[PDB]
Amino acid sequence: KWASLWNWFNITNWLWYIKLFIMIVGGLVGLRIVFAVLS
Amino acid sequence: KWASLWNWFNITNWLWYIKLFIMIVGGLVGLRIVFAVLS
Amino acid sequence: KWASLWNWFNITNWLWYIKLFIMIVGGLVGLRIVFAVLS
Predict the structure, then answer these.
(1) Which region ranges are annotated with the description MPER (chains A, B, C)?
(2) Does residue C25 belong to the interface with chain B, where contact is any CB pair within 8 Å?
(3) For chain A, after which residues does the C atom lie more than 2.5 Å from the next written residue's N, i.e. where is it broken?
């Protein structure tokens, strides 16, 4: 089981506004900028 | 009519959480990663 | 002081509906497309 760690994980993914759910998208797309620079 | 076509647009798109509204944008960034890996 | 601009800035960013909060993520992806077309 992991019920208390699941509640914070749900908070960390996106339980209220924005979070990883959007910030996985913003950082990956940012990352392709400097990736074109160095690759 | 306007209300019926806007209703058909919202059901097919993103009436509720996430949908093609996030999935169409997020899968296109996913597609470039592996594009570099295999190119 | 700063209030008339700031309230405008927040409504420009995102109060209700899409705005720069979805336009930074979306236009950044739509950037990678022409990137690849010209590279």
Answers:
(1) 1-19
(2) yes
(3) none
Sign of the dihedral through C-alpha C2, C5, C11, C13: negative
Q: Is C32 on the interface with A (CB under 8 A)?
A: yes
Segments making up each domain of chain A, as ranges: 3-38
Q: Which residue of B has its CA nearest to C27?
A: B25
d(CA B12, CA B4): 12
Instruction: Supply A7's token pair.
Output: 């509640």
Q: Which two structure tokens, joined as six digits, stand for C24?
A: 């930074």
Contact residues, chain A, for C35 at CB < 8 Å:
32, 36
Distance CA A39, CA C21 (A): 29
CB C22 within 8 A of CB B25: no
Alpha-helix runs per DSSP H in B1-39: 2-12, 19-38
Residue B38 half-sphere exposure toward CB, CA atoms < 13 A: 5
CB pairs under 8 A between A and C: 14
